[PDB]
Request: fold
Amino acid sequence: MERFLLNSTVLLYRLSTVSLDEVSLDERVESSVFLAQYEQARSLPDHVAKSAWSYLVQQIKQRNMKLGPVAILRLIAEKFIKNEKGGPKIDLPMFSEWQTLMSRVSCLPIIACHQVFNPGPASQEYSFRWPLYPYHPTVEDYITRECLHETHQHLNGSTSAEECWLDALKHPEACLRDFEKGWASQEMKQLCAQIDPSLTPRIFKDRLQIACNIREILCRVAQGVELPEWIASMQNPQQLANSTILHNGREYGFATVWPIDDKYSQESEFCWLTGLLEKWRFNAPEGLERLLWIYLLIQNQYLTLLVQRDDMTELREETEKSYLSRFKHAHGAGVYSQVRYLEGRFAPKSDPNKMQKLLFSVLRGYWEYLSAHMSMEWVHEKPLTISQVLDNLELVEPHGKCVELALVPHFIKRKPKNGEAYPHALLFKDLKNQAAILMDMLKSEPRLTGWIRGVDAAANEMHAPPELFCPLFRVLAKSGIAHFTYHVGEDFPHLISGIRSIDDALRFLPLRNGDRLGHCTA
Amino acid sequence: MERFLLNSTVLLYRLSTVSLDEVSLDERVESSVFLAQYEQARSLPDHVAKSAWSYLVQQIKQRNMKLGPVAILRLIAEKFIKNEKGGPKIDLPMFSEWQTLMSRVSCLPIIACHQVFNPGPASQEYSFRWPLYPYHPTVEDYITRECLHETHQHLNGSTSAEECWLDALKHPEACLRDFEKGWASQEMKQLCAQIDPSLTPRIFKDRLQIACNIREILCRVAQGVELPEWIASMQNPQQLANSTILHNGREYGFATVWPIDDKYSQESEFCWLTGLLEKWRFNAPEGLERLLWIYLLIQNQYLTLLVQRDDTELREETEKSYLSRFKHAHGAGVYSQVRYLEGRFAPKSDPNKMQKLLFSVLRGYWEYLSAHMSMEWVHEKPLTISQVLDNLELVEPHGKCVELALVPHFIKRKPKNGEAYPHALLFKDLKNQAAILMDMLKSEPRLTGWIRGVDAAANEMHAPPELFCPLFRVLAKSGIAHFTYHVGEDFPHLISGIRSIDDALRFLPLRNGDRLGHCTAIGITPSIWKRSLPLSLSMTKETRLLDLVFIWRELRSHPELLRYASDAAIEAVRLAHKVFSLEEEVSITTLDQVFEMRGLLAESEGLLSELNEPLKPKSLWLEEYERARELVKTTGMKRPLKLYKQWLTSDNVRKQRAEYVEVALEYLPDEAVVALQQAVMAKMADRNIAIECPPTSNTRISQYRNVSEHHIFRWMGLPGEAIEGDVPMSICLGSDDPGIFAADLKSEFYHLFVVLTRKFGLSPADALRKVAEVNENGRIYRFHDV
Amino acid sequence: SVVKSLNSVNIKCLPTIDPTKLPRHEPILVTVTARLNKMVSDKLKGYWASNDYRKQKEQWQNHLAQLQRGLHLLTDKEYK
Reply:
C-alpha cells in the first residue's frame, strides 16, 4: 500500500508548498494518499483503503515512531528483505509483490534502511551495486553451473533507471535542456501531464534544484557536522528552487563538501544515506523528516517519468565510463560472471564521425573489463582506436565464465513523413543513410564482422511495415552481417492485425534459420 | 471517444478559460481528451485511443460538420437512438453500451438531438419524461399482463437524477449550501477532489451560475430572437459567473422571459434544446457553439458529482414532488407499468417533521389516484392525515394503478467513543426515532396498512446488524409486521461479509416472508472478489474475532473442511486472550455462548445496569428488558455473561476491539469461502427470506469487468455462472441507487433481459421466464397488506 | 515608552493590548493567549529543525489543547 505513500504527485505538491514549521500534517497526507491511491488503483475499494491506512497508522504508533519516510522504510525493509546466506536477500513468497513495488519505488532508500535497522551477520562489508535477488539454492546451482544468456540489453542510455537519477542530479541544466527539447512534441507533453498534471519544464528544473539542495542539506546531518544555521531563515521548501538563499542579506549556497570524491554516485548515495538514517534511529524532527520525504518523493517522480520516456546531451556526457559499468554490472558479484552470452543493442547515428567514437567506446569498455579479469599481455596498454582494440580482443580465449559480447545495432524509426507520392522516402533515406555508415565501416575493418553480428529495427509497427526493411536487410546481408532480428507486434489496432503484422515480417524479411523476432505478444 | 467529450474535468477547464473569439482548439481538446480518458479508463491502450480519436475526427470531416456538441450528439444520436413503433427507443445490441454511457452523459440532449435530426414518423405527438428503453415484444407484453413490482425506491428526493439538475438551477443558493455543508465534512472533500481536485465552494457557485447564464443566452438563440447586443462585451465564460455584464457602462443582465411560465421544468428544457438544435442544423456560430459545450460539460459534471456524493434541499424537495414520482413510476398509458411499489423514506426525530412528510406522501399518492380513479371521494380536498386514510380506504387494487407501502429506513452512524457501550448515542436516536413512529402510528392505527416495513441502510462497518434486535422486536409488537435489512453490500473481507449476513439471519427477528437488501457477500465468486486486491487486507479485531468464531460454526460441520475449522478455533482462542486480556482458559464453546448473547440490549437489567433496580412502568420495552435479563440469570451459567460485560463496558476491551489486524487475502482457499456461502443459502432458504438485488447498471462494486459477470446471474442459476452445490434463493427486484443519471425499473428489467439473450445465448421465451421469476418474487414477498 | 525600554535582566514583554480595542464579547484571556501564541510560535520558527524543536512544540500543542477545553468551561451559556 506504501507504493502510493512514497510515489505520488499529489503528496509532493502537498509537502513542497506547505510550510516547514507545522507538524500536524497527518490529516493532509491521508487525504493525499486517498487521492493518490484512487488515481493509480481505480479498482481498490475505499473501505479497504481506509482500513489499510488506519492499520498502517497503528503500526507506526505501536512501534513508538513518527509517520514519515524513516518509519515507512522501516516497515518496508523488514516486511520484504530478510538476511540470508548471501547477505541481504528478499522473501520468496513476497518477491512477486516486491517486483510490483520496484515499478513505483526505487530500492536504494529501502536497502539503506534495512542495513541500518537490520545489519547482516559478522559485520562483513557489503557494498550495494546490484538490485537484491531472492535466493533459492536449486536455481543458484543452475546459474553457477550454467551461466545466464541475455538476448536484449540496450547498451545506449544508463545501466538502469535508478542511477540515471544521480546523472540527472549531476547534469541539472543538461537534463533540463534535454527535457525542453522533447517537450515540444505533443506526445511528450501529454505523457508528462499524464503522470504529473501541471508540470511545466521550469517546475522540473525547480524540483531537480530542490532535490539537489536537499541532498546537500541532508548530507550535513549524516556527517555529523553542525548545520550552517541559515536554515532558520528558510521557512518554505520553495526557497530551495533557486539554489541560493539570502540570510541577513548575504549569498549562501547550499553546497557543502563531500568526503567521497564522486558525490554523485551509487557509493556516495548509500554511504550518506546509511549515516543519515543511523542518526535518526530514535528521534527525527518533522522538518528534516519531511526534507527527506520530499527528496524521496522527488526521486520517484523523476524515475516514473524516466521509465516511460523510452516507450545527445545527457547520453554523451561521458560515453565511455558507463559501458564498463554496465559490463561489470552484467557480470554481477563474485569471481565468475552470471551472464555468458550477451548482445548489446545500440542506436546507430547518421554521422559517420560518431560510429568510430561509439564503437571504440564500447570496444574499449569491453577490453578494459577483460584486462581487469583476465590477466595477460595485451598488444597495447591503451588502444585509442578501433583497430588496436581488435588486436587486443582477438587474443582472448572464451572460457565461458566471462561476459561474451556480440554488438547488434538496432535501427530507429520515426513517424511517417508526407511527400513525393509514396509513403516512406524521407524516413527510408535516413535508414539508407545510417546503414551506409554501418556498411562501409564494416568493410573498412573486416575484423569488425566478429562483433557487429545482427541488425534490429525496434521502434514500433504502425510507422513502417516490415516489408519496407526487406531491401534494407538483404543489402546488409550481402555486406556480411550474418544475423538479423526484428521487433514486431507491440501495439496493434486489433488482435487480428497484430497476427498479420508478424506474418508480413515473417514472409517478406530475409529471415534465415536461427533468426530472432521481438516481443511477439500478438 | 464520444463519451469523453461530454464528461471530462480537464476539457471544462481547457474551454472555460479559453476566449470565445479564438477557434483553433483541436490540438487543445485532443490533448484534453486523451488525458481525460486516461484518468477515467486507465486500462485503455494509447494506440487504440489515438486511433479512436482520429476515426472520430475524420468522421466529422466526412459529415462536413464542426467539432462540438452539435456534432458529437448527432453521432451518438445516429449510433444509439433508433426509431420504432413506440417512438424513439434504443436498439437492443447496443443497450448495454448505453447504460455504460448513461453513467457519464445525461440522455436529455441526445433525444433532443435525435428528435431534430431523426424525427419520428408523421411528427406524431411525442412527450418525453422517462428515460429511453429498448423494445422487445417478448418483454413489453409481459409488463402489460403482469406489471413490474419494485421494492426499494428512496422517496426522499425526485424521480431520477437528470431533473435534479434542473432543481440545482432553480435553487442556486440552496444547492450551494448543501454542497458547502457537505464540503465541511472530510468525506465530501475527498470525494470532490476525487472527481476534480480544482473544486471549491467558491468555484461551485461559479460553475452553477455559468450554466444558468448560458441557459439564458442560448434560449435567446433558441427563440430565434437576435442577441440583446451585450454579447459584444462577451469575451470569456468567466463573465457568466456574476449575472451582470457591462457594455459601454450601461446596465444589462442575462435573464430573459420564456414562452412557458416555469422555465425550470422538464418540458421547458426539451422545447429550448430542440428549438436550439433546430436552428443549428447546418452550421453554428463558434462562440455560442462552445457555450453549449460548456453547459453540457457543467451539466454532466454536477450529475457525476451528485451520483458519487450519494454514495436544506431535502425539506423543500419533500413537498408534492411525490405526485410527479408516482406519475413517473406510473409511466405513459392508462395502466401503470409498476403495480407494487415500496417507497422507502428516512424518518426524522421531531414528531412534527415526521408527521408533515408522512402526510405529504399519502396526500401525494391520493392525488395520483384522483387523476386516474375518476370516482367520488369522501373528502375532495383532504389536506389532513385522517381525510387521506378515509379517502384511501375506498380504493380497491385491480392491477392497474400503483400500490404503495411506505417503509421507513433508519440510518446507522459512527460509534461515538464512550457512554459505556459501543453505540449509545446512535441507539438513543434510533430509540427516539422509532418511539415517534410507534406512538404516532398508535394515534392513527389505520396507518399499519401503509407503514409496513422497517429498514436500515447507511453502511455496514458503522454499526453491526445485531444492534437492531431489541429495537426491531419492540416494533414487531407495535404492529409493523415486516422487517427488512440492507446488509452485506459493503464489507472489509469476503468471509467477514458472510458473517454479517449470518448475523442478520441468526439475530434479527426475521420471520418467513421478510427480505434482505444487497446480499452482495453471498453473491460474489471468491475468485472474482480477489481481483485487483492486495495480498493482505486489514480489518478491525472485533470484526475479525466475530469472523473466527463464526467460521468455526459453519466449518466443523463440514466433513472435509476441518483443517480450516480446527485452525480457526485454535487461533480464535489466541485472539480472545489478546482482546479480553484474560488469564484463565476459555474454550471455543464458551466463545460461541458469549457471542450468542450479543443480541441483547445493553441497558437490560442484570446485564449492564444494577440487578436490584425498581421495575420500569410497563413499556413495550419491559418485555425486551426482562427477557434479556431472566435468560441471563437462568441456565445457571453466568461465566459467559461476565465476559460479555467486558465486551461492552471495559476500557481496554473496547480499545483492543477497534485496533486493526492484518488478514491474508487468501486466508480461506477458493473452495473454502464457497462452503460458507452455500451454508448461508441453506439457512436463509429454510427461513425463506428474499434478497433485494441492486440494479446491474450500478458500477459500484468496482470488481466486475462488465455486466455479464454480475452476481445476480449466479443466484438465478445460469449455466456457466452457477457454482456447484448452490441452494437457489428467492430474489426480488429493486432500483434504489442505479449509479446512472436517468433510470427506472423498466430499464433495469430490460437490462437483465438483454444480457441473457446476448451474452449467455438464451431464447427470448426462456430468457423472459428467468427474469420474470425475479419480477414476481417482488410480488410474493410484497410488504403491502392483503 | 516602558514596554520599549523592557523590549530594547532579560524580560520579554507582550505588545500593548487595549481591551476597548477588542470584540465586545471576546474575553481578554483569549486575546492574551492568541497574542502570546504569536510570540512563542515565532521563536519556534527560529528554534526550528532540531531535536528539541519537536520536544518544545509538543508541550506547546498540549498547553493550547488543554487550555482550549477551559473555553467551553467559561464561554458556555449554561453548562451541560
